[PDB]
Write an enzyme that holds these catalytic residues in place. Structure first.
Site, PDB file in Angstrom:
ATOM      1  N   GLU A   1      -4.785  24.128  -8.753  1.00  0.00           N
ATOM      2  CA  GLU A   1      -4.797  25.612  -8.873  1.00  0.00           C
ATOM      3  C   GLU A   1      -5.354  26.109 -10.316  1.00  0.00           C
ATOM      4  OE1 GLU A   1      -0.827  26.931  -8.384  1.00  0.00           O
ATOM      5  OE2 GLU A   1      -1.450  27.251  -6.078  1.00  0.00           O
TER       6      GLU A   1
ATOM      7  N   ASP B   1     -21.516  17.816  -7.117  1.00  0.00           N
ATOM      8  CA  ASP B   1     -21.071  19.037  -6.248  1.00  0.00           C
ATOM      9  C   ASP B   1     -21.589  20.055  -6.809  1.00  0.00           C
ATOM     10  OD1 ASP B   1     -19.317  20.237  -4.434  1.00  0.00           O
ATOM     11  OD2 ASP B   1     -17.726  20.280  -5.952  1.00  0.00           O
TER      12      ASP B   1
ATOM     13  N   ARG C   1      -7.297  28.379  -5.616  1.00  0.00           N
ATOM     14  CA  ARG C   1      -6.709  27.178  -5.464  1.00  0.00           C
ATOM     15  C   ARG C   1      -7.728  26.414  -4.519  1.00  0.00           C
ATOM     16  NH1 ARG C   1      -1.739  27.729  -1.633  1.00  0.00           N
ATOM     17  NH2 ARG C   1      -0.565  27.943  -3.694  1.00  0.00           N
ATOM     18  N   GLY C   2      -8.155  25.326  -5.110  1.00  0.00           N
ATOM     19  CA  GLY C   2      -8.973  24.334  -4.433  1.00  0.00           C
ATOM     20  C   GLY C   2      -8.443  23.270  -3.740  1.00  0.00           C
ATOM     21  N   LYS C   3      -9.089  22.295  -3.471  1.00  0.00           N
ATOM     22  CA  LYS C   3      -8.726  20.969  -2.640  1.00  0.00           C
ATOM     23  C   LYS C   3      -7.571  20.545  -3.489  1.00  0.00           C
ATOM     24  CE  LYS C   3     -13.183  20.651  -1.131  1.00  0.00           C
ATOM     25  NZ  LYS C   3     -13.854  21.323  -2.454  1.00  0.00           N
ATOM     26  N   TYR C   4      -7.975  20.095  -4.783  1.00  0.00           N
ATOM     27  CA  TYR C   4      -7.495  19.170  -5.759  1.00  0.00           C
ATOM     28  C   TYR C   4      -6.559  19.962  -7.017  1.00  0.00           C
ATOM     29  CZ  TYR C   4     -10.384  15.802  -3.541  1.00  0.00           C
ATOM     30  OH  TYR C   4     -10.912  15.067  -2.639  1.00  0.00           O
TER      31      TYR C   4
END
Length: 324
Positions: free
Chosen positions: A50, A151, A45-48
């Protein structure tokens, strides 16, 4: 105010496109069938989002599903569609509406990756060159298509080391490059942020990704994770200045008529530029060569306009030993 800047390559690619190419806000999503996909395991699960491993029950193929946690949705989708089929670009296979989140779920091709922390412990000199070349193919393709990734970091490079296959993933921070446009400097991860971000210079370009690639390369050839190990975004610049030196930092900011945040007055100090041989030791020496150091030196430049472009990087002697 700040002096403007433009990319030295692929400057005007988006200006010659139909509006539809870059006007992602107007993009109409094409939706597939969510029942084609069965989630198998949550991978993260990242910032933005799943992220899940899943199976496409229509071909029984493994896929990766990213269920998006506003404008970033269509931007990422549009960039993925624009770049699809390009060298080493992750393939967006489908887009479906998740019935639980009610948000878009991006379906990607599966790559059998090995964790970089364990994988960079095992790369030979030859493999570092080989995989760097493969990353450059993706970055040059993106730039030639008017896109900066923004990124680049080891977590966004998926490698199937058995098959010697690489994909550049997570285009959720990517943007279209438009000459003269000011961008958010709150992009990339701390240890990979270029100096332009750290000094709040907004008119950056594809060359940001070449700084990040250089920071990755330095960590790999020197066996130092991360190479520039800042405690926060300010200390991050100081860690860079302790290697590249402060005089060239001031020359950079002076060229673009940028003023450092005054909080640097008490922390930046005065530092000479170091020679790269400083970082060589018995444990990393097998990964270092004169070609590697020269290549690194030409990526890790303060002035974004002076870094090698991805295409120039592919010309460098460091890659002469790599079979093409």
């Amino acid at each position: 105010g700040p002096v403007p800047s433009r990319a030295r390559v692929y400057t005007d690619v988006n200006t010659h496109r139909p509006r539809e190419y870059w006007d992602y806000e107007s993009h109409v999503v094409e939706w597939g069938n969510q029942d084609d996909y069965q989630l198998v395991r949550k991978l993260g699960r990242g910032k933005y989002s799943e992220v899940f491993e899943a199976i496409n029950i229509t071909n029984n193929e493994k896929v990766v599903v990213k269920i998006l946690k506003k404008k970033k949705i269509k931007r990422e989708i549009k960039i993925l569609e624009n770049l699809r089929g390009g060298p080493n670009i992750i393939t967006l296979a489908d887009i479906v509406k998740d019935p639980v989140s009610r948000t878009p779920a991006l379906v990607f091709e599966h790559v059998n990756n090995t964790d970089f922390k364990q994988l960079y412990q095992t790369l030979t000199d030859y493999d570092i060159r080989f995989y760097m070349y493969e990353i450059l193919k993706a970055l040059d393709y993106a730039a030639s298509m008017g896109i900066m990734h923004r990124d680049v970091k080891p977590h966004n490079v998926m490698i199937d080391h058995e098959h010697r296959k690489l994909r550049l993933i997570d285009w959720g921070l990517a943007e279209f490059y438009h000459p003269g446009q000011e961008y958010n400097v709150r992009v990339a991860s701390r240890y990979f942020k270029g100096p332009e971000l750290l000094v709040d210079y907004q008119m950056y370009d594809y060359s940001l990704d070449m700084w990040s690639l250089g920071a990755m390369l330095a960590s790999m050839i020197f066996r130092k994770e991360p190479f520039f190990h800042g405690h926060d975004n300010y200390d991050q610049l100081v860690r860079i200045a302790k290697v590249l030196g402060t005089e060239d930092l001031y020359d950079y900011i002076d060229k673009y008529n940028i003023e450092l945040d005054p909080r640097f007055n008490d922390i930046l100090g005065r530092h000479s530029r170091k020679r790269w041989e400083r970082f060589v030791h018995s444990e990393n020496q097998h990964l270092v060569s004169p070609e590697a150091l020269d290549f690194l030196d030409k990526l890790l430049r303060y002035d974004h306009q002076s870094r090698l472009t991805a295409r120039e990087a592919m010309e460098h002697p460091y890659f002469y030993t790599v079979v093409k």
